Design a protein around this ligand. Sequence first.
Ligand SMILES: O=C(O)c1ccc(-c2nn(C(=O)c3c(Cl)cccc3C(F)(F)F)c3ccc(Cl)cc23)c(OCc2ccccc2)c1
Ligand SMILES: O=C(O)c1ccc(-c2nn(C(=O)c3c(Cl)cccc3C(F)(F)F)c3ccc(Cl)cc23)c(OCc2ccccc2)c1
Lengths: 263, 262
Amino acid sequence: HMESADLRALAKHLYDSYIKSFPLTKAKARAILTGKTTDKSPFVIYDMNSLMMGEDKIKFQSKEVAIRIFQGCQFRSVEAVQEITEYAKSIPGFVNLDLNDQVTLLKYGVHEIIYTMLASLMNKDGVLISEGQGFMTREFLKSLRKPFGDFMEPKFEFAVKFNALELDDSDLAIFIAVIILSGDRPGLLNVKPIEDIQDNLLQALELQLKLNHPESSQLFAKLLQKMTDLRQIVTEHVQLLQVIKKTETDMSLHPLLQEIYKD
Amino acid sequence: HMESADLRALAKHLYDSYIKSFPLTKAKARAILTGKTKSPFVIYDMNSLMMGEDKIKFKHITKEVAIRIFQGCQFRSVEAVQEITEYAKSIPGFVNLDLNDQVTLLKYGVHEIIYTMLASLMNKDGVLISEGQGFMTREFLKSLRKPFGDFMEPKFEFAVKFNALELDDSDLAIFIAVIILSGDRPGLLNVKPIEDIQDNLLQALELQLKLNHPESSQLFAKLLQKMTDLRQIVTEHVQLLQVIKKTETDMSLHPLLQEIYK
Ligand SMILES: O=C(O)c1ccc(-c2nn(C(=O)c3c(Cl)cccc3C(F)(F)F)c3ccc(Cl)cc23)c(OCc2ccccc2)c1
Ligand SMILES: O=C(O)c1ccc(-c2nn(C(=O)c3c(Cl)cccc3C(F)(F)F)c3ccc(Cl)cc23)c(OCc2ccccc2)c1
């Protein structure tokens, strides 16, 4: 049990690190998605022709479109892992944990966080890409061939439901921290100090949601229930990736991701 | 939304019905398991199973041993379904829901609730059966042949972790109600009143845990996380059943029995 002032201080700390760690915040993604701004309008990729113009317009190849787009998602997921790793080190107590457990917490946590933060970039019609300079439609992603089309759509299915909670970045900063400090990850050596940190973070989250969303009934519980789903959604993802990996030979996985998916 | 007085009234309402609905409470089960109550009859191997079904005549195991015990678990689960169904009717607002939604909520909820309440009857060493008159050891269940041994042990693995929360019956009564009133069951027609009731139940559970376990930090959060496991555990359970159905040919019952257990 912490005191209110300590819990608000912890919320403010985590929000600050989150802003420092993640280049594209949910506040900026929503500004882009809502538009009504000449300067932040994305280029929209909705078919083959617009994808080609996008590579010349947005900028920042011998392969089939579905693979090209897959490698774009994995390239960006690897960067996400790096950004999450940097954020986690700022969580008070994280770097003090047993080093193997730091690895284990990141190993089982990054996917759940990527899904969570991917929602920030999504609405029911598509997803921001290339730091918000681009927008790729859900339809175009869903129409990709073989197993790639159905591989993309579940990320959207989760996001629409998650976005209905209407969390902002200051809420997400603590929620992401709670996910990382999960004491039930397989193979953890010292569960107790991880749970002590999470209890502080859960207390921090509970008060943050009560202050930021005072009219949102049992948002804390509903958000914890979302952390339930993610576990199975991540399971379905990893299953699909392994099946695709066997069929598709022109699919490479970044060694960082390769190691994460081992057991 | 709700007032403290209303949340306590709802907690006590649910506790009273919980006691009426289920034959063997957790409080009574713990007294038996700890040896602090007539020793229950112990089934620890093949021969003691025979003596118990001849002396007690356990209604679920009245063919191969592993299949006999497997189907006994189904018989009791079917009884549990009716007990949970009757309990659900005592949840304020439940009987007023659309009839199809009551059916849907019960259909997709009973598995999670049976697992939850099975923990009340279990310790790391075994499980109470026949309203506590019997105790079947974990070791004997785990050692059953082919997939049946592997079918039993996950239930103990879950139960041991769940029991570490040290919930009592007054906590479980609300928790079970929260599970039933889940707004994400496939095919629900009117989600809004289901979530409205669950929100009331969540408030009652939260206050119940703070009053009943004032020293248990974030027990509310930890218990909601257990509803994580339950979802995945039930899915692996159904996958485990399908493997048995295809693999095992000695599972055949009378077609009427298959319908009852369908
Ligand atoms: O910016 C960001 O923060 C971001 C985080 C995630 C994705 C993204 N990953 N992804 C995956 O499948 C995936 C996940 Cl979730 C986790 C781990 C590994 C993988 C992978 F290795 F398998 F790749 C997606 C599937 C569908 C969609 Cl729509 C998005 C993702 C992301 O795509 C941006 C993007 C979209 C379209 C084209 C190019 C780039 C961005
Ligand atoms: O009294 C009670 O409250 C009770 C609730 C559950 C069981 C029990 N079910 N079970 C299942 O597999 C199962 C579950 Cl969890 C959920 C849904 C459907 C099924 C099923 F339909 F597939 F059956 C078990 C597996 C292993 C064990 Cl040890 C117990 C259970 C119960 O066994 C009593 C018993 C123990 C040993 C032999 C015979 C009977 C009692």
